[PDB]
Amino acid sequence: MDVFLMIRRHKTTIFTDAKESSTVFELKRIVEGILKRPPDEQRLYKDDQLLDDGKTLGECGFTSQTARPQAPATVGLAFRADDTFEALCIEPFSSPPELPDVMK
Amino acid sequence: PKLTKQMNAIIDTVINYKDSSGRQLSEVFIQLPSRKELPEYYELIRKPVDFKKIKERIRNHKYRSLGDLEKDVMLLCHNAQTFNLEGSQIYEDSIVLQSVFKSARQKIA
Amino acid sequence: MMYVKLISSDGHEFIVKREHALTSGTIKAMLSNEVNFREIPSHVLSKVCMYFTYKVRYTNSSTEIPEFPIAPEIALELLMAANFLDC
Amino acid sequence: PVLRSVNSREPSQVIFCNRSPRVVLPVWLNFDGEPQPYPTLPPGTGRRIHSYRGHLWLFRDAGTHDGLLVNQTELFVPSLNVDGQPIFANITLPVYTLKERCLQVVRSLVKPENYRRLDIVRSLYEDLEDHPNVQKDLERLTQERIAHQ
């Protein structure tokens, strides 16, 4: 069936949705729409594992079970700058503040 | 002392109240269901009270404050609002006796 | 498939599908691209996007609908966000 | 009202499939209007019911008393039995306007009294003591019918 994902990179966060069936490059064409950046200048990551471009989403962990719309999977993205690539970086989301004393 | 005569005359009104179409409303709440008969009820109603369990405390001598009874009576209405649903007359009956009670208390002060 | 940039009180960029992002009653007025907030942090904004994702995907569909999860502390933070962005 | 049960006395065996994560409570609206608190089905449990045709059932989470869908609809009237197969009633929660899903977490985590001790936008404190009611949502359904019929 489907997969819903958060392509997180620094302060950026791209919420798209592919197919259980689809592969790595296929997502990069989506990014090559949002940012309009070419796939070779794109290094797709998951856990820190540099995927493929022709490896099925279901295989690499992305199922209908773990990529829920209200619980989307984080897919980090590294970028090419002068042949040499950059380090994968995502600045985390702001910590949910203190819990009220009537809520505790 | 005199309190126990007030408290009786206060609750007696409600107990003796026959509605707009001639029929006692309170009749239901007088005696709470039997334990093994309606267990389902008791779990949710973690504090059960029946009109006979108030009449008891008056007769015996418990509420040594006239307000002390209002606090208890409101509980019977809360338990009844708790279990029972908005619509069912059991729920729409607690409200009556709840407004009516404070009107029999408006009688004293 | 168009996308819009939602930005918070911590510069956090949020590219979400223009159709998914139009589910908001408040955002819709400012469209019919670059939307900015200040009362809204990032942790709430990602959850609001996650609600946006969800809504379209499980609205109208007769298939069984899953449980929407709210983290206890984000719940009020989100309660005034759902008030503002008008769900 | 315009919504109540039908004393047909014609039996029809029902099965309360609960595809919902909550403690789903059935509510049978007796022959005049009294909503009835029938026993609760936790997530999954598919208890059989010996209801009748023309009878009415609706569903709410046992703690909050919120809105549940019974066959992708608000209400449920059981059809007369067929081929000796019992009539199903698969239950699920809808897609709520975030405010309601929030107010569920909020009303569930804050106790009835403390509802205003909190730090929020003023307009919301009032949406809190708006606990989803049956009579409200039903006489509100009764309103939506004569707004089409």
Curated annotation (Swiss-Prot), chain A:
One of its GO terms (cellular component) is cytosol. Its main location: nucleus. Residues 1-66 form the Ubiquitin-like domain. The modification Phosphothreonine is found at residue 84. It is found in: Nucleus. It holds the Pfam family ubiquitin. Pathway: Protein modification; protein ubiquitination. The keyword Transcription applies. The modification N-acetylmethionine is found at residue 1. GO terms for biological process: positive regulation of proteasomal ubiquitin-dependent protein catabolic process; protein ubiquitination; protein-containing complex assembly; target-directed miRNA degradation; transcription elongation by RNA polymerase II; transcription initiation at RNA polymerase II promoter. SIII, also known as elongin, is a general transcription elongation factor that increases the RNA polymerase II transcription elongation past template-encoded arresting sites. Subunit A is transcriptionally active and its transcription activity is strongly enhanced by binding to the dimeric complex of the SIII regulatory subunits B and C (elongin BC complex). Core component of multiple cullin-2 and cullin-5-RING E3 ubiquitin-protein ligase complexes (ECS complexes), which mediate the ubiquitination of target proteins. By binding to BC-box motifs it seems to link target recruitment subunits, like VHL and members of the SOCS box family, to Cullin/RBX1 modules that activate E2 ubiquitination enzymes. Component the von Hippel-Lindau ubiquitination complex CBC(VHL). Belongs to the Elongin B family. This is Elongin-B. It comes from Homo sapiens. The lineage of its organism: Eukaryota, Metazoa, Chordata, Craniata, Vertebrata. The gene is ELOB.
Curated annotation (Swiss-Prot), chain B:
Component of the multiprotein chromatin-remodeling complexes SWI/SNF: SWI/SNF-A (BAF), SWI/SNF-B (PBAF) and related complexes. The canonical complex contains a catalytic subunit (either SMARCA4/BRG1/BAF190A or SMARCA2/BRM/BAF190B, mutually exclusive) and at least SMARCE1, ACTL6A/BAF53, SMARCC1/BAF155, SMARCC2/BAF170, and SMARCB1/SNF5/BAF47. Other subunits specific to each of the complexes may also be present permitting several possible combinations developmentally and tissue specific. ATPase involved in transcriptional activation and repression of select genes by chromatin remodeling (alteration of DNA-nucleosome topology). Component of SWI/SNF chromatin remodeling complexes that carry out key enzymatic activities, changing chromatin structure by altering DNA-histone contacts within a nucleosome in an ATP-dependent manner. Binds DNA non-specifically. Belongs to the neural progenitors-specific chromatin remodeling complex (npBAF complex) and the neuron-specific chromatin remodeling complex (nBAF complex). Residues 1-108 form the Bromo domain. Belongs to the SNF2/RAD54 helicase family. The gene is SMARCA2. It comes from Homo sapiens. Zn(2+) binds at residues 61, 78. This is SWI/SNF-related matrix-associated actin-dependent regulator of chromatin subfamily A member 2. It is found in: Nucleus. It comes from the Eukaryota.
UniProtKB/Swiss-Prot annotation, chain C:
One of its GO terms (biological process) is target-directed miRNA degradation. Ubiquitinated by the DCX(AMBRA1) complex, leading to its degradation by the proteasome. Keywords: Host-virus interaction, Nucleus, Transcription, Transcription regulation, Ubl conjugation, Ubl conjugation pathway. SIII, also known as elongin, is a general transcription elongation factor that increases the RNA polymerase II transcription elongation past template-encoded arresting sites. Subunit A is transcriptionally active and its transcription activity is strongly enhanced by binding to the dimeric complex of the SIII regulatory subunits B and C (elongin BC complex). GO terms for cellular component: Cul2-RING ubiquitin ligase complex; Cul5-RING ubiquitin ligase complex; cytosol; elongin complex; nucleoplasm. This is Elongin-C. GO terms for molecular function: protein-macromolecule adaptor activity; transcription corepressor binding. It is found in: Nucleus. Pathway: Protein modification; protein ubiquitination. It comes from Homo sapiens. InterPro entries: ELC1 (IPR039948), SKP1-like (IPR001232), SKP1/BTB/POZ_sf (IPR011333), Skp1_comp_POZ (IPR016073). Overexpressed in prostate cancer cell line PC-3 and breast cancer cell line SK-BR-3. It comes from the Eukaryota. Belongs to the SKP1 family. Transmembrane segments: none annotated. The keyword Transcription applies.
UniProtKB/Swiss-Prot annotation, chain D:
Keywords: Cell membrane, Congenital erythrocytosis, Cytoplasm, Disease variant, Endoplasmic reticulum, Membrane, Nucleus, Repeat, Tumor suppressor, Ubl conjugation pathway. It is linked to Pheochromocytoma: A catecholamine-producing tumor of chromaffin tissue of the adrenal medulla or sympathetic paraganglia. The cardinal symptom, reflecting the increased secretion of epinephrine and norepinephrine, is hypertension, which may be persistent or intermittent. Changing residue 54 to R: In VHLD; type I-II. The keyword Glycoprotein does not apply. Changing residue 54 to C: In VHLD; type II. Changing residue 118 to Q: In VHLD; type II. Changing residue 96 to D: In VHLD; type I. Changing residue 24 to L: In VHLD; type II and type 2C. This is von Hippel-Lindau disease tumor suppressor. Belongs to the VHL family. Changing residue 21 to S: In VHLD; benign; type I. Residues 97-106 are annotated as: Interaction with Elongin BC complex. Involved in the ubiquitination and subsequent proteasomal degradation via the von Hippel-Lindau ubiquitination complex. Seems to act as a target recruitment subunit in the E3 ubiquitin ligase complex and recruits hydroxylated hypoxia-inducible factor (HIF) under normoxic conditions. Involved in transcriptional repression through interaction with HIF1A, HIF1AN and histone deacetylases. Ubiquitinates, in an oxygen-responsive manner, ADRB2. Acts as a negative regulator of mTORC1 by promoting ubiquitination and degradation of RPTOR. Changing residue 52 to H: In VHLD; type IIA. Changing residue 8 to W: In PCC and VHLD; type II. Changing residue 110 to F: In VHLD; type II. Changing residue 14 to G: In VHLD; type I-II. The chain holds residues 61 to 209 of 213 of the full protein.
